[PDB]
Design a protein around this ligand. Structure first.
Ligand code: HEM
Ligand SMILES: O=C(O)c1ccc(-n2ccnc2)cc1
Ligand SMILES: [Cl-]
Length: 393
């Protein structure tokens, strides 16, 4: 009764243009079986949301990539937060939620905004720039390593390490194999910066280590939670900001609306997260036989959630393939949903907001003026190169 499809959602052709295949996945049924990788798939909003919100049945501790940690050794020691289930998940999550809290956002917002304004001013002096290297990468690199408390030396490891982490959630294709082949120097740098003496006072890493005397985490858990932020906290924002700039470049009417009301910056970023869904996919593993969308899935089965597809599902969204900066975006799953819903989302939204505010106040037009090149990753969707001309306001 479950339809079987040969679509490979980790193939370069799929990454190059996922939208037709995502409609095929949605319209085939609420639950599909992907014969290429022997996993179940859910691509509609309803089933993605249901799976996210039943962590008991659809667990994370057997891994949120294709690999099942009950069958294979994880490529690195499991994350204490992303790859943990309640109750072990709960207190590390609470620590990261306090480290990346509103009060923290209040302490960093002015500096993050000043850096965003400064970057757009610098880019306007050049006029023609690459909105990936020169903006989507450069701006997070200018604020997030410092906010972590990292030293200057070795920061060139951070984007390659993150690319490895996000490729490693994928199946054992060439993208994953090559990433792991090149991993040893990046893992070495990252594991070393996770130690308490290497994290500057007041930054996110030091604050994690400071929580090790409350009973929520022990000192030996703090380095792995720092590792979580060094895995996730930079490349996600690169692709979120890149998505927002790409949306504004393709939809100039929405850039004009944003210029006319810069307080739409935060929602324009949120809509870009829905529209592009930089984090495309995550897996769960069933802990029992379960009925989902009328289908019966056995115990110990991997279930692939298409977050980007759920965010384009016309069963949930009006005009899903339109970028609309005043859309009611609440409920999109681009940050997940439920107990694992992105604990760094306030950092992501802060960066995206202040960059889009800088653009709204300083830029009159964003025109693609060179070849667009896509970046291929088993989990992240985004561009390698986005040549644009920025016209000043
Ligand atoms: C636009 C940017 C981002 C997007 C689209 C995004 C997406 C997501 C998603 C979909 C999840 C859910 C994972 C799951 O259900 O298995 C998640 C969780 C998480 N994110 Fe983000 N993220 C972003 C930025 C960040 C940032 C900036 C940080 C850190 C500063 C961060 C740290 C985390 C962590 C630690 C988790 C695990 C939370 C848990 O398992 O309880 N993320 N993110
Ligand atoms: O704990 C980890 O190692 C880890 C945690 C979170 C992500 N992630 C994905 C999207 N936002 C964050 C990636 C890795
Ligand atoms: Cl590592």
């Amino acid at each position: 009764t479950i339809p079987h499809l040969a679509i490979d959602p980790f193939s370069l052709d799929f990454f190059d243009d996922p939208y037709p295949d995502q409609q095929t996945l949605r319209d085939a049924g609420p639950v599909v079986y992907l014969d290429k990788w022997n996993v179940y798939g859910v691509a509609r909003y309803a089933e993605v949301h249901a799976v996210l919100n039943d962590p008991t049945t659809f667990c994370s501790s057997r891994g949120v990539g294709l690999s099942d940690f009950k069958k294979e050794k994880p490529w690195r020691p499991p994350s204490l937060i992303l790859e943990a289930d309640p109750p072990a998940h709960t207190r590390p999550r609470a620590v990261l939620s306090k480290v990346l809290s509103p009060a923290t956002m209040k302490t960093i917002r002015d500096g993050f905004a000043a850096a965003a304004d400064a970057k757009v001013d610098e880019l306007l002096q050049r006029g023609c720039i690459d909105a990936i290297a020169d903006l989507a990468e450069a701006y997070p690199l200018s604020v997030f390593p410092d906010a972590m408390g990292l030293k200057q030396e070795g920061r060139e490891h951070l984007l390659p390490y993150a690319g490895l982490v996000f490729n490693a959630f994928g199946p054992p294709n060439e993208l994953r194999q090559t990433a792991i082949e090149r991993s040893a120097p990046h893992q070495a740098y990252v594991n070393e910066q996770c130690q308490r003496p290497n994290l500057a006072p007041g930054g996110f890493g030091a604050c994690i280590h400071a929580f090790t005397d409350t009973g929520e985490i022990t000192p030996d858990e703090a380095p792995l939670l720092v590792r979580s932020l060094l895995s996730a906290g930079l490349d996600t924002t690169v692709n979120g900001i890149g998505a927002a700039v790409y949306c504004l470049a393709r939809f100039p009417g929405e850039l004009q609306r944003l210029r006319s009301d810069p307080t739409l910056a935060r929602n324009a970023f949120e809509e870009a997260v829905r529209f592009e869904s930089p984090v495309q996919t995550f897996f769960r593993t069933t802990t029992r036989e379960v009925e989902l969308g009328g289908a019966v899935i056995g115990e110990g089965e991997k279930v692939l959630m298409f977050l980007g597809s759920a965010n384009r599902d016309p069963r949930r969204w009006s005009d899903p393939d339109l970028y609309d900066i005043t859309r009611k975006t609440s409920g999109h799953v681009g940050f997940g949903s439920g107990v694992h819903m992105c604990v760094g989302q306030l950092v992501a939204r802060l960066e995206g907001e202040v960059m889009l505010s800088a653009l709204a106040r300083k830029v009159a037009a964003i025109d693609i003026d060179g070849p667009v090149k896509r970046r291929f990753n088993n989990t992240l969707r985004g561009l390698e190169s986005l040549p644009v001309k920025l016209t000043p306001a």
